[PDB]
């Protein structure tokens, strides 16, 4: 499912061409609101006062039809840039008036070019409207990757075109699109219609739209190429663009007149569909993932919360997760007890954090597996997952398991553990308290005793994603701090971002932790070396686990563990965006931090510029103890 | 006929052109209109020929005696002719080549060819026999506001935009375009001087140009200046047209002699009778036809 428009400056008879391009098979229609030539004048007598009527009625076609077929678009002379005074304020009337007009007929949306650099005026006339009357119709910006003066062909005797690269400079239509939705406040109703050119440019410059609010995509009739059997094309170079732009679910628009004169209209959105099809389908995690992509939400706490029952089933559902941990606690069962001892020796289980029991299972199916004896401990402080624990006990486990409705950290175990085995990671590995649940748990593990996981180190990468720094700046809310939604963390499946340098590792704990003067609280400065121009919105974080030995899992992209799902990244944000150049340093600085009762993180960026320090004493968010 | 006058154009006999679009209201079409008396006009029902277009008249001109080329906010470069009694206006083509509304157009001086320019920022060569594209110029990174054909040279025209380009044209050259403020929105070339054209920008100025090195120049008009028309005169005057929704005719050194505001809302075309080089016919969105008595 292709959604499909079709621009048009030329619209004799609007339920004709409306009707046309329905039976074409495009969804909507955009098509100025007022005809594009009739200029209108708002000071100067006579033409001031120009018998009406100034454009179509609204009685042309349904409500229905207005709100969810047409995009209204400016009228190509309203300049509230030029130079001219007065071509500036008829501009700014005309527009006004064109924008109100496509409220007043309630359109989805309305489209205005950034077609040169200062666009400054136009973005005050648009916030202006933006702040009159109550509406919600979609601004989109019809910028071009390529500016038509750097993509003119090479005709002018006297003003040659550059043959030199600009890198910057090749970039410009991004600074345009970043001007505006600056000087506009980053309103949410304001998005690009990226405009694709017949020759596209350097990958960085396509790059440098990665977590840009991307609503639609032109494409002129002119890019199309012609196949063998005369029909509209486009190159793997326009493909691979596309396929990254199906991935953001853009509106395509085609714009400009028939060329392929053999085949019916279709044919473009044919190509469309084709492409469409023809895409790899979508992977088990992004099947599971559709429909969270950046969908912002609270880090659960499993320690200070109480976690709901469908909570834990979406835990058990990762069957990736617990061949691993089984294939963990097997590999250490034979490591532990030698064969000659097997009947002898019958292993101190400790499932500490047991929820409803799947690693209670785990451990279970491994000590079968491995031929050795175990004593299963099933510690869950949750007294409603112990429910489903003590049915399971009665039921199926038996004598064999013991279920302990405790805290780790207060529990007087009746005997020491051989393996401590666990499940307390969050996104960033630490973030639901790992470190102290474990630490309080330690005195009753055995001298040689092992912790299943054994070690845990949380990853940070620096992003762009405008689209998520929006994201953030709604989650204000009453009666807090009106900036405290910048100070905490999201658990988020990132999408429409760019990740602007390669993971490195953050935080590191290790279990048992024999170091005699123990302290779970840290300091991390990371140099994150950026080879594009871009804006920071904040830090993507991940995360690595030690099983044991070789059995690891993974939520860092790059060692991404196959098949797992139960995690997504986490996002610190930042409050203010940060310009970073080709060639710098982004250098962050990590605080985990706590008191008797909380644990939280602390952060700044230092350079290419300074931040504040996000999230001073846990102010804005704390993980409870 | 419709509200809004874009066009208008004598023949070598006087026989007047019309071209129209509805700007407004329900349907937005065009038309072409033939008045063999031009003092019946603007009133359709005492006229020589008429015809409905799908879409509106941007910009036309004459093709000699009998044919009309015509801009549509449609992409198509549009070739009507009238039949063998000029009664009827006939479609010979409609090419559908530019991505936006056509805005400009001029035929080259042999006549067998024509320039088109739009606001896909496009220059267009059309070879008028064979009905194709011959050449398609990206020189502009603008709306394409007017093109004028060089009087005597075939190769030869003159091009400007919103970029604030005006650009030489000769398709001899390897690179054809050359690069000669506030933008230029209006050309003409001088009709007994080769070398030498006029131009007038957003702003009201006209300004005369030397091809061999903005040189003269009048504030003429408080608003753009939409159209500049040579008269047939061995020493001719130029008519200047605006958006303030007035007429002048001016002198050589660009000094005001006549000046009508008869005309309510803009001004769209002029246009000096050959049977009488005195008067001027101007025409205007005010459905208006204006005969000018200019004391020449
Ligand atoms: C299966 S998700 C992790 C499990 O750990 C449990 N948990 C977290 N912290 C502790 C603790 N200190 N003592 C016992 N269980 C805990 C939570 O209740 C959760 O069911
Ligand atoms: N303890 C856990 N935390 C998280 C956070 C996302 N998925 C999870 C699974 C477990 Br088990």
Known sequence: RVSSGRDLNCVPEIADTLGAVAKQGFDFLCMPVFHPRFKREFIQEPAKNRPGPQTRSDLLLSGRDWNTLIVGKLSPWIRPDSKVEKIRRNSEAAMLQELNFGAYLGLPAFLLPLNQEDNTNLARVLTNHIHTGHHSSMFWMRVPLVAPEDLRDDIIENAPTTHTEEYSGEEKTWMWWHNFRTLCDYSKRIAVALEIGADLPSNHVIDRWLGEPIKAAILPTSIFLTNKKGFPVLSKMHQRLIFRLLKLEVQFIITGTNHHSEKEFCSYLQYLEYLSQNRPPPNAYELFAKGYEDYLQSPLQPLMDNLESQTYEVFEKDPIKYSQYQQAIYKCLLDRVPEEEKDTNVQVLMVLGAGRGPLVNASLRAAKQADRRIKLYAVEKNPNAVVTLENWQFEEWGSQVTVVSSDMREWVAPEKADIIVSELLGSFADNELSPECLDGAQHFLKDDGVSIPGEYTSFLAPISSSKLYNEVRACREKDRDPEAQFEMPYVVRLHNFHQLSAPQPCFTFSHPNRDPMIDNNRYCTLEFPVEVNTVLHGFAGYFETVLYQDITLSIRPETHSPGMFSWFPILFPIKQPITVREGQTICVRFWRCSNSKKVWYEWAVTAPVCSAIHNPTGRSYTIGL | ?296
């Open chain 2, 1 to 296: 006929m419709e509200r809004q006058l874009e066009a208008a154009r004598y023949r070598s006999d006087g026989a007047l052109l019309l071209g129209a679009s509805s700007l407004s209201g329900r349907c937005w079409a065009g038309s072409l209109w033939l008045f063999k008396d031009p003092c019946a006009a603007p009133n359709e029902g005492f006229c020589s020929a008429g015809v409905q277009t799908e879409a509106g008249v941007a910009d036309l001109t004459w093709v000699g005696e009998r044919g009309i080329l015509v801009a549509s906010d449609s992409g198509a470069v549009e070739l009507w002719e009238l039949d063998e009694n000029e009664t009827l206006i006939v479609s010979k083509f409609c090419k559908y080549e530019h991505d936006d509304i056509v805005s400009t157009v001029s035929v080259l001086s042999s006549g067998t060819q024509a320039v088109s320019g739009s606001k896909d920022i496009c220059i267009k060569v059309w070879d008028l026999a064979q009905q194709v594209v011959l050449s398609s110029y990206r020189a502009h990174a603008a709306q394409v506001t007017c093109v004028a054909a060089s009087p005597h040279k075939d190769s030869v025209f003159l091009s400007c935009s919103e970029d604030n380009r005006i650009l030489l044209w000769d398709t001899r050259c390897p690179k054809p375009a050359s690069q000669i403020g506030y933008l230029p929105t209006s050309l003409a070339w001088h009709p007994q001087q080769s070398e030498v054209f006029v131009f007038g920008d957003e702003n009201g100025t006209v300004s005369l140009v030397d091809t061999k090195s903005c040189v003269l120049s009048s504030a003429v008009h408080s608003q753009c200046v939409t159209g500049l028309v040579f008269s047939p005169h061995s020493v001719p005057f130029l008519a200047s047209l605006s958006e303030d929704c007035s007429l002048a005719v001016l002198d050589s050194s660009l000094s005001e002699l006549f000046r009508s505001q008869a005309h309510r809302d803009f001004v769209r075309d002029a246009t000096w009778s050959p049977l009488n080089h005195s008067l001027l016919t101007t025409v205007g969105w005010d459905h208006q036809v204006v005969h000018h008595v200019v004391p020449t």
